[PDB]
Design a protein around this ligand. Structure first.
Ligand code: CL
Lengths: 105, 99
């Protein structure tokens, strides 16, 4: 298939109260398709780092890979990790970019 | 090519808005969220993640996303039924909030 980039971002959480990422995921009768960055919030660690983008797929947190768990379980892990101190390592597939919110109609 | 295209005709007499948010890539435009009790919510067929291909006689496949959105707003503002043609996502998108 067409080449996709992956990046690993190490976040110093000392000066932040949040990653500042929303998470969206698709789950239906056909399976779970993984979890993605929905949007980013200025003021959080991920914005300050400046590499991750809406639409990127979150593959792994620290050494915990999500590709063989449910979206719900992946989110449980992310939840656990953000409530503990110290650096957070996020690895994303660069599936994102090019997204625009047009608002309500 | 599209898998599962549906035609959704909305009666816009009972409603003011479609009650959908739109996000575009580019790529094309997609349903971001659906607001309870709006035309689209009342209708029930369209789901978050579906791709919006056409409205009435205006096909978006040869149009920029910004132009598509402006066409759509113009049409919602004017009286008349609205026919949306969507390519289905399969549904099941979930918002998990913030971290
Ligand atoms: Cl990297």
């Amino acid at each position: 298939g067409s080449h996709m980039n992956i990046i690993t971002v190490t976040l110093n959480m000392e000066k932040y109260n949040f990653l500042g990422i929303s998470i969206v995921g698709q789950s239906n009768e056909r399976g779970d398709g993984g979890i993605y960055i929905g949007s980013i919030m200025k003021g959080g660690a991920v914005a300050a780092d400046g590499r991750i983008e809406p639409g990127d797929m979150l593959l792994q947190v620290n050494d915990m890979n999500f590709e063989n768990m449910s979206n719900d379980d992946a989110v449980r892990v992310l939840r656990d990790i953000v409530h503990k101190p110290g650096p957070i390592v996020l690895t994303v597939a660069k599936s994102g970019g090019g997204w625009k919110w047009y608002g309500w109609f």
